[PDB]
Design an enzyme around this catalytic site. Structure first.
Site, PDB file in Angstrom:
ATOM      1  N   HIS A  43      10.197  -9.748 -10.648  1.00 49.18           N
ATOM      2  CA  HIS A  43      10.504  -8.455 -10.050  1.00 49.18           C
ATOM      3  C   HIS A  43      10.155  -8.407  -8.563  1.00 49.18           C
ATOM      4  O   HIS A  43      10.694  -7.563  -7.856  1.00 49.18           O
ATOM      5  CB  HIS A  43       9.794  -7.314 -10.790  1.00 49.18           C
ATOM      6  N   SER A  68       1.489  -7.479  -7.368  1.00 49.14           N
ATOM      7  CA  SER A  68       2.535  -8.153  -8.135  1.00 49.14           C
ATOM      8  C   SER A  68       2.640  -9.616  -7.728  1.00 49.14           C
ATOM      9  O   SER A  68       2.584  -9.952  -6.536  1.00 49.14           O
ATOM     10  CB  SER A  68       3.885  -7.482  -7.919  1.00 49.14           C
ATOM     11  N   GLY A  69       2.754 -10.494  -8.732  1.00 48.32           N
ATOM     12  CA  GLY A  69       2.920 -11.913  -8.501  1.00 48.32           C
ATOM     13  C   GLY A  69       1.635 -12.713  -8.430  1.00 48.32           C
ATOM     14  O   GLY A  69       1.681 -13.941  -8.549  1.00 48.32           O
ATOM     15  N   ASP A  75       8.777 -12.134 -16.810  1.00 47.32           N
ATOM     16  CA  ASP A  75       8.675 -11.661 -15.432  1.00 47.32           C
ATOM     17  C   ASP A  75       8.047 -12.771 -14.585  1.00 47.32           C
ATOM     18  O   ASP A  75       6.903 -12.687 -14.134  1.00 47.32           O
ATOM     19  CB  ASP A  75       7.853 -10.374 -15.392  1.00 47.32           C
TER      20      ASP A  75
END
Ligand SMILES: *[C@@H]1O[C@H](CO[C@@H]2O[C@@H](C)[C@@H](O)[C@@H](O)[C@@H]2O)[C@@H](O[C@@H]2O[C@H](CO)[C@@H](O[C@@H]3O[C@H](CO)[C@@H](O)[C@H](O)[C@@H]3O)[C@H](O)[C@H]2NC(C)=O)[C@H](O)[C@H]1NC(C)=O
Ligand SMILES: *[C@@H]1O[C@H](CO)[C@@H](O[C@@H]2O[C@H](CO)[C@@H](O[C@@H]3O[C@H](CO)[C@@H](O)[C@H](O)[C@@H]3O)[C@H](O)[C@H]2NC(C)=O)[C@H](O)[C@H]1NC(C)=O
Ligand code: NAG
Lengths: 218, 223, 98
Positions: free
Chosen positions: A41, A173-174, A88
């Site tokens: 994402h 995120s990530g 994801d």
């Protein structure tokens, strides 16, 4: 990271900052000299040509000669589902290889299918916001979290800080979840806002994708 | 305006171009001069500061014919309901009177309780977009047919024929569109309607505030 | 420091206004940021409050990016991906409540 602490300078030399022109937008993990790993994402809607992969960073607000900056040569995904946030995960091939030193090193991944039970202690980290709408970090942050299965899904690794409104936040995120020296998670989503204190954070389960990752990077 | 034509420059000297700002953002609407000190428009165009331009054709050019006047008061109807979009009417008291000339001139309002038979052809004008993809720099206009009220009554839960007008043949790709809000509906050179709302697709019919239903409030407010 | 075109539709109805949201480009922003901006104009422009949204059958907005990509973001969900992105890359935002 809400409620964490500053990491020691280059304590986590696999930690990566994905940046646009306007700055850090997601974390990632260096998994080979020419590959990093992040959340699908994070890059679904960005111009990939404009992304800069920054290795060896610590204080994003200062100029650091420890840094090595790369561009993305190629994207690899495996069944990303943005409606249900399944799989994801994204692998970004670099337009070159890092030079491995004390500040830039490859992370170790678990074996395929290894599943963590509740109570396992992990470390989350990243340059995301320090409060639930506050400013992004300059110094890389780290946070002690615990694997929980309650209020989770089987398709995720979830983590909680008991009794504390702490957790990952926007910009995390990530970023990797490190358990027993292995990268077991990729920060994927929060519930009830950042640092709810009620719902665990959800990480993409790296061990479920290890055979696919090895397909790519070897 | 969708499916219309470019107006002859300065042929509608009452047309007002509104630039609205608030802490939240910016908006563009239309309006019309009803007295030298007043512009009529829709309540949903309200904001903290409103800049009014009379006498314009190309609103992207600083034409010599233009007069730029800020709104001293932006008076929404006191029963405006922004959910149902009822009583969608607003008066702008200008910070100075306009200089009347061939290019800047008020438009007449209908008489007390004056209606508008279905089938009547009227004209709406504005500087709104002409499609999903293309805007306009100059004033445009289109003729629309007044519909029987059943057309709006069946698709708009809150349509009230005592205070609104059902306008636009569903078979014709002709409508007001984004930026035309507040502009007039002109029938025989009388401003019977104010552009108010419609379906987000732009498919007709659309709803106009019926000016004549608000003449007591208008007169009381302008005195 | 940047104005983004946006629309509101409620049960398919909208006012034909040309409207732009002010959104900061001093730093990267998040979908939680845009949720707050979107809910604010839902309330001020169309009388749709926080509690109204609990009762709405659907409440969403779509962020249209300049590169042709779009992101639909439900307003009735408190699940967020903790990523950031640039306000400069947004083309427009369509809000829709039914
Ligand atoms: C918060 O988390 C840190 C780090 O967590 C550990 O390292 C991460 C990179 C992940 O791999 C996690 O899965 C892993 O748990 C914890 O620090 C660790 O504490 C332990 C116990 O205090 C240390 O073990 C000791 O090490 C000393 C030598 O320094 C030995 O003599 C002892 O016999 C014992 O083995 C461990 O070294 C230390 N690890 C690091 C990298 O600092 C920390 O305990 C934890 N805190 C809380 C409150 O949960
Ligand atoms: C892979 O991509 C990275 C990220 O951009 C490249 O790093 C950049 O390397 C160049 C040198 O080759 C650095 O100098 C700059 O070069 C450009 C021409 O491409 C020039 O117009 C500039 O004036 C500047 O001198 C550049 O600073 C550096 N980027 C960063 C952010 O540090 C790298 O070269 C690429 N590797 C390969 C093998 O192509
Ligand atoms: C009103 O005019 C002034 C002077 O040019 C301008 O700075 C301002 O942006 C205008 N107001 C609005 C709300 O557009």
């Amino acid at each position: 990271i809400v409620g964490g602490r500053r990491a020691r300078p280059h304590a986590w030399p696999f930690m990566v900052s994905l940046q646009l022109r306007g700055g850090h937008f997601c974390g990632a993990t260096l998994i080979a000299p020419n590959f990093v790993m992040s959340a699908a994402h994070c890059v679904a809607n960005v111009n990939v040509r404009a992304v800069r992969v920054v290795l060896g960073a610590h204080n994003l607000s200062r100029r650091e000669p420890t840094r090595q900056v790369f561009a993305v040569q190629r994207i690899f995904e495996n069944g990303y589902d943005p409606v249900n946030l399944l799989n994801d995960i994204v692998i970004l091939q670099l337009n070159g290889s890092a030079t491995i030193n004390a500040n830039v090193q490859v992370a170790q991944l678990p074996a395929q299918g290894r599943r963590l039970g509740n109570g396992v202690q992990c470390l989350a980290m990243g340059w995301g916001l320090l409060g639930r709408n506050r400013g992004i970090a300059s110094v890389l942050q780290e946070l002690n979290v615990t694997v929980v299965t309650s209020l989770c899904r089987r398709s995720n690794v979830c983590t909680l800080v008991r009794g504390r409104q702490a957790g990952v936040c926007f910009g995390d995120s990530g970023s990797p979840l490190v358990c027993n020296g292995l990268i077991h998670g990729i920060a994927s989503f929060v519930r009830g806002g950042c640092a709810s204190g009620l719902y665990p954070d959800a990480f993409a389960p790296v061990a479920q994708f290890v055979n696919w990752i090895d397909s790519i990077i070897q | 305006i969708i499916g219309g034509r470019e107006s002859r420059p300065h042929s509608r000297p009452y047309m007002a171009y509104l630039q609205i700002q608030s802490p939240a953002g910016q908006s563009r609407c239309g309006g019309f001069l009803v007295r030298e000190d007043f512009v009529l428009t829709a309540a949903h165009c309200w904001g903290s500061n409103i800049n009014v331009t009379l006498g314009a054709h190309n609103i992207q050019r600083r034409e010599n014919t233009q007069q730029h006047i800020t709104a001293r008061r932006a008076i929404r109807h006191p029963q405006y309901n922004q959910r149902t979009i009822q009583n969608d009417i607003m008066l702008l008291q200008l910070s100075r009177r306009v200089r009347r000339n061939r290019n800047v001139n008020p438009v007449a309002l209908p008489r007390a309780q004056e209606g508008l038979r279905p089938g009547t052809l009227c004209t709406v004008a504005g500087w709104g977009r002409v499609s999903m993809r293309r805007g306009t720099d100059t004033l445009r206009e289109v003729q629309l047919r007044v519909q029987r009220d059943r057309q709006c009554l069946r698709i708009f839960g809150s349509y009230d024929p005592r205070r609104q007008i059902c306008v636009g043949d569903r078979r014709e790709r002709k409508a007001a569109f984004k930026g035309d809000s507040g502009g007039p509906l002109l029938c025989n050179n009388v401003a019977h309607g104010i552009v108010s709302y419609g379906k987000s697709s732009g498919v007709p019919p659309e709803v106009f505030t019926r000016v004549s239903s608000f003449l007591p409030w208008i007169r009381t407010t302008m005195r | 420091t940047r104005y983004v075109p946006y629309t509101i539709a409620v049960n398919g109805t909208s006012t034909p206004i040309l409207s732009k949201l002010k959104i900061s480009n001093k730093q990267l922003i998040s979908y939680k940021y845009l949720n707050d901006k979107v809910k604010s104009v839902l309330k001020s422009e169309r009388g749709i409050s926080d509690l109204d949204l609990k009762f709405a059958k659907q409440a969403k907005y779509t962020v249209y990016f300049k590169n042709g990509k779009k992101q639909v973001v439900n307003l009735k969900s408190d699940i967020f991906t903790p990523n950031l992105f640039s306000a400069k890359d947004i083309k427009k935002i369509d809000i829709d409540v039914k």
